[PDB]
Amino acid sequence: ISSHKAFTHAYLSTVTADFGGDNFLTCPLGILFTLGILLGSGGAQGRTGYQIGKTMRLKSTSSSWNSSEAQQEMKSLYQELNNSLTSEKTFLEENVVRISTGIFVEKTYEVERRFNESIANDSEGELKQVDFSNRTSATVDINDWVDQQSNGLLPDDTAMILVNVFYFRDFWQSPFEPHYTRKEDFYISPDRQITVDMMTQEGVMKYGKFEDEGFEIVSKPLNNTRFTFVIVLPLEKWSLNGATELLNGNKVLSEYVKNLKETTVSLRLPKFTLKNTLDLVPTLKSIGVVDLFDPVKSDLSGITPNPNLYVNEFIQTNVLKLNESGIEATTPFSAIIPEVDFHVTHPFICFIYDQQLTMPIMAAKVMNPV
User: Fold this and answer.
1) How far apart (Å, rounded) are the C-alpha atoms in residues 17 and 11?
2) Theoretical Cys-Cys bridge with 102: which of 75, 122, 163, 291, CB 3.0 to 4.6 Å?
3) CA pair distance 266, 102, nearest whole angstrom
4) Among 312, 294, 315, CA closest to 159
5) CA torsion sign, 334 to 336 to 342 to 345?
6) CA angle 315, 245, 254 (to 5 degrees)
7) Where are the alpha helices (DSSP H) in 87-203?
8) Domain extents for the chain?
9) Please, are residues 81 and 29 in contact by the beta-carbon 8 Å criterion?
10) What is the separation, in whole angstroms, between the first and last Cα of the chain?
């Protein structure tokens, strides 16, 4: 198995465990790039960099710590994935995918020239020194950075904060007609129904029913058709069924996506937008990245001669906005009689799926569209 897919699985089986009762939204490759940057840049050394490499499932760290080889292998992976994703274009002429890592370090810390240059020479990475002693101004700086990356959509004794932003944006290959959007009931649970703006369309799309796992799936392509929006809909309204195994990665999404067939579908789909902020430190500790987060053990000598530099917070902030135009987008009845109804009227799991990487770059559970 490829390293980044191994990471992705470990990360998803852990992080999804505690969200049985919430909306959930995450982008696993942004965690990989942000983590990876510290090792790829020479920043993380000794056992701190080694842990990163193991969790990343690198060859150079398979059986021993090999600091130069590991950094090279990590930088190369990171860059390959970044190049692959940011090469995808969309005409509004923008990037379909925007990857952003902000490294926020207390201004007191001295910053090795080699690191500073490595992060400068890094496209998606940015180092920002900041006064963590003045809480209000530090907060401002960060909020501004985030605001700048999201196109607007969005302690004390803090040494360092890492912030990952993963922005995906494209039109549907085949957009919904708004005139067909109407209010409809959405079943959350026995004691909860809400009214949603329900988009509707009849169309050709990839579809499959998986009776034994208790769900069905459609794939609705984005305009850059390397990316598709995959909806996983439980066969009944009361339970997620096997759909949780695709979200946590125990079941391999690409194996399901490969088996869908072209079909005429009556599709109903809520318009919604999820926002969220994940604290990844506990999950990352849980999957093997420990020294990075600890004042005593932390070895960031590649970043600063000043010891005691460690990461206080590692935060991913995400947005999933779906509407008639597309994802994070802005802008007659069919003569067809569809073979299949796909009416998204109860909680579902969805993905932005990458057809080249054959993996999801965004994983989400939607229990309560709002």
Assistant:
1) 11
2) 163
3) 42
4) 312
5) positive
6) 90
7) 113-120, 135-149
8) 1-170+271-324, 171-270+325-370
9) yes
10) 37
Q: Any residues with CB less than 8 A from the CB of 36 and at least 6 apart, and which?
A: 52, 56, 74, 75, 77, 78
Return the bridge partners of 318, or none. 276
Length, in residues, of the chain: 370
Rounded to 5°, the CA angle 327-333-336 comes to 95
Residue 190 is which amino acid?
A: P
Question: What backbone phi and psi angles, to 5 degrees, belong to 194?
Answer: -130, 170
Residues 234, 343 contacting (CB under 8 angstroms)? no
Helix, strand, coil fractions of the chain, as percent rounded to 5: 25, 35, 40
**Which residue spans within the chain are E strands per DSSP?**
24-26, 89-90, 94-95, 97-106, 125-130, 160-168, 170-171, 182-189, 192-210, 215-221, 227-234, 261-270, 272-279, 313-322, 326-327, 340-343, 348-354, 359-366
Residue holding tokens 């999804």? 16
Question: CA angle 120-125-127, nearest 5°?
Answer: 65
DSSP state string for 196-252: EEEEEEEEEEEEEEETTTTEEEEEEEBSSTTEEEEEEEESSSS--TTHHHHHSSSS-
Beta pairing, strands 182-189 & 94-95: unpaired
What is the DSSP secondary structure assignment for residue 176, as one 8-state letter? P
Q: Options 2.30.39.10, 3.90.1150.10, 3.40.50.2300, 2.30.40.10; which CATH number does 171-270+325-370 get?
A: 2.30.39.10
Exposure class string for 298-327: b at 16+ Cβ within 10 A, else e = bbbbbbbeeeebbbbebbbbbbbbbbbbbb
Resolution value in angstroms? 2.4
Domain 1-170+271-324 = CATH 3.30.497.10: yes
